[model samples]
Structures are given as C-alpha cells and as structure tokens.
Target: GSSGSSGTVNVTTKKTPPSQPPGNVVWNATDTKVLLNWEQVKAMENESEVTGYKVFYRTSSQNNVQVLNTNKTSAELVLPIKEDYIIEVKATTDGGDGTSSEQIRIPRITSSGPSSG
Candidate 1:
C-alpha cells in the first residue's frame, strides 16, 4: 500500500490604484477677505470612512490658530491685511485621526507681485 499527496498552487498580483496625492493649493484676494481653495480627497479604505477636510491656519506674527472642517473642496478664508500666515490641509477620517499635508506659508502680495511675504 502507498499514499501520496502532491499539488501545485499559483498566485497572481493585482494592480492597486494610486495612493492619495496632494491637491493643488490656491489663494484668492478680495475686498472683504482672502479666499482659499483646494481639491478634496476621497475615501480609500473600506474598513474606515473619510469625514471631510480639516483646514488649519495661523498668522505669522500671531500665535493664535484657527481650524475649519468641511467636505467641500473650496473655502473662503478671512484674513487681515498686511499679515503673513501659515496654512495646512488634512483629511479627517471616521476614526477621528487625520492625514496632514506639508504646511505652507501664505505668500504676501503687493501692487506689483508677491513680496518677501
């Protein structure tokens, strides 16, 4: 009597969609205030869900901070005149934790163009 077990298994790889990429950041000036806009990120994980974008900003001269959370890709930011600011974007997930982008300084503008702002 004899017993034998032999089998072969094969595996294949599947391509995954690109990881979430940073979106373009834009700033707008108005008579009343400064407006800011950026692209929104979509949910990528199945186990968790994305709530919205978290915007953080602070004046360069002031230590105070402001925070906003919204699902829209665009936002109207109110800022003071002749003030420099730093802005940051983040993705708020259902888990309450969020992913953040590189902090950037809002460029100051003049009648000619952007200054050393």
Candidate 2:
C-alpha cells in the first residue's frame, strides 16, 4: 500500500491607492454668491478617479453643518450675508474619501449706501 500527501498555496494581493485629500483650495465672493475652487489629488493605494467633491460650511458663530456636492472642482453658492462663514472641501474617489483641506473663513458684508439729507 502507498500513501500520498498534497499541499495548497495561497496568495494575497494589496492595492496601492493614490494621493489623498485635495490641495490648493480657495474661495471668492461676489455680491450674490460665493465661488469655491480646489485641486484634485491622485490616489496611491489604488487606481481611482475623483468622482465628486463635498463642500461644508456654516456660520462662524454657529455649529450647524451645511453640505454641497458637485462633480467639478469648483462650486457657486448663494448664501445669506451679515454672518461670517467657515468653509472646507473634501474629495471623493472610488477608493474612498480623503482628508479635508484647510479651513477658510469668509467675512460677510452687506451692500448698503450712505445716508443723505
């Protein structure tokens, strides 16, 4: 009689994602709206694409969170004035969401004219 033994081999693979968190985030304000822009970052962990971006903002004195989603790198929003606002941006990818950019403070000033007799 003869006996035989068999063994199995297993292999594991990991994905190398790209860079995270967007860069060079900036914002501009007009008489009626605010313009936001940011740079898209590459992924290192895995090959992925930036599908969209998320914008978060709220009154400087309040803790309420306002969110806006967009496919492009920039966005235009119409918000109320007289209250300072804080804004931040984050990028979304197929791999996952990256860190948020630096926080920016936008001071709001109302459009008014001087008094006359």
Candidate 3:
C-alpha cells in the first residue's frame, strides 16, 4: 500500500445537458382547444437522452403563463378566445434544461360555425 500511497488520484463525473431544441412547431386549432406538434429533440450518439419537453404558453399581454411537461413530441392545450397566446417548446434531459425554440403565436379562435372567420 505504501507504493500506491504516494500517487494522488481523483475521479470526476459529469453530465452534458441536452443540446437539441424543439423546432418545426405546428399547431391545429379548434374553437376551444389547440393541438401542438413539434420536431423531436433527438440525442446524438453517446449523448444524454431527452427526458421530456416543457411547453410554455401565455397570453399576448403577458398576464398569465401556463406550462406543462410531456414525454411526447406533441401536446394539447385549451385557451379562451378572449386572449391571444404564444407558445414554445423546450427539450430537457437529466443533465439540465435545453434551449427553447422560437416562440409561436396562437391567435384567439372564435369560429363556431363554417360561416365564420
């Protein structure tokens, strides 16, 4: 043991935060709900895997913001026609939270009949 005692040794462990961000976000709208889909944030070879996605949405006036975490590439949300909203998707990993894609706007939907705008 004395021979090895003279050598100083240390071990380091670290994790790299997911680098991919959700993109190509698209949404389908109805009178009371919106279905959102986006490109998956895949991990590179030997990289940290994606754990989940954080969906950030809020009114245009920044009055309120709602958030949800999902394990899928798509999500659904309900919003009233009284306020316009903006949404973004952020991928996450065990290491840390990834960046968010560009924010997309969802205008208030009020089309109750085929004859409406």
Candidate 4:
C-alpha cells in the first residue's frame, strides 16, 4: 500500500516590473548643492519590490547620465551650476530597472565661489 502523494509546490513566474516613474517628485537647490526627494514606487502582485532608485541627470546640451544610486528616496548632489539640469528618477529591483519619473527641470544658480553657494 502506497502513501498519499506529497503536496505540490508553486513558484512565481513572469515577474512584473515596478511602478512607472516615482510620485510627488520634488527638490530644492542652493548655490552648488541640490536636494531631491520622491515618493516610493509601487509594483504588481508578482513583481519584485523596489530596492532602491537611480538618478538620471542631463543638461540642455548633453545626453542623460545615470549618476546617483541610493536606497533612500532622497538624494543630494554637489555639482556645477549656471546651467540647467534635467532630472529623472527610476526605481530598481531584483529583476530590473523600473521606469523613470516625470522629468524635472532645475534652474541654474549663481555661486560667488566654491562652497559659497
């Protein structure tokens, strides 16, 4: 006489990507430093959770460059001013890089000297 069969296991497949773009994206900038924060992204039931985020920045003359990666929803950067910058944030997960947030155009600033902004 044979015993009953063992229970079958189920696993997730066809993973879904995280939410498109971050929510309530906002930022503040000084003479040379800029602080930006965004809302956490959402995902589908079978998708991976957002582990962190990436910041893609560019200027009016240059292509987009992904610069910052942080687990927190906020980021601060110290870079050159006097030229506008376009920022787009995207969510990251165990699977892939999620979509980006709405692009934010940061105005240029005027700094008298280094660390003086």
Per-model C-alpha lDDT, please?
A: 0.64, 0.74, 0.79, 0.80
Query: Lowest-scoring 10 consecutive residues by lDDT in candidate 3?
Result: 1-10
Once fitted onto the true fold, the runs of candidate 2 whose alpha carbons sit more than 4 angstroms away are 1-19, 45-47, 110-117
* TM-scores of the models, in the order given: 0.62, 0.70, 0.74, 0.74
Q: Candidate 4 local accuracy as lDDT?
A: 0.80
Model 4 regions more than 4 Å off: 1-14, 110-117
For residues 28-74, write the lDDT of model 4, one tens digit per residue: 87666778999998777877888889988777457656568888899
Say which prediction, candidate 2 or candidate 3, comes out ahead on TM-score.
Answer: 3
| Runs of candidate 3 exceeding 4 Å displacement | 1-13, 110-117
Local accuracy of candidate 3 as per-residue lDDT tens digits, 20-39: 78888898886667889998
After superposition of all CA atoms, the RMSD between model 4 and the true structure is: 11.6
lDDT at residue 99 of model 4 (Cα atoms): 89
Task: Report backbone clashes per prediction.
Answer: 0, 13, 0, 0
Question: What local lDDT score does residue 28 receive in model 2, on the 0 to 100 scale?
Answer: 88
Better of 1 and 3 by TM-score: 3
Q: Which ten residues in a row have the lowest lDDT in candidate 2?
A: 12-21
- Candidate 1 on 1-117: residue-level lDDT in tens? 999989899884533322343378676778767677776666554534545677777777767667887676666677544667777776666555355666657756555755657
* CA error at residue 12 for candidate 1, angstroms: 29
Residue 115, model 1: Cα distance from true site in angstroms: 21
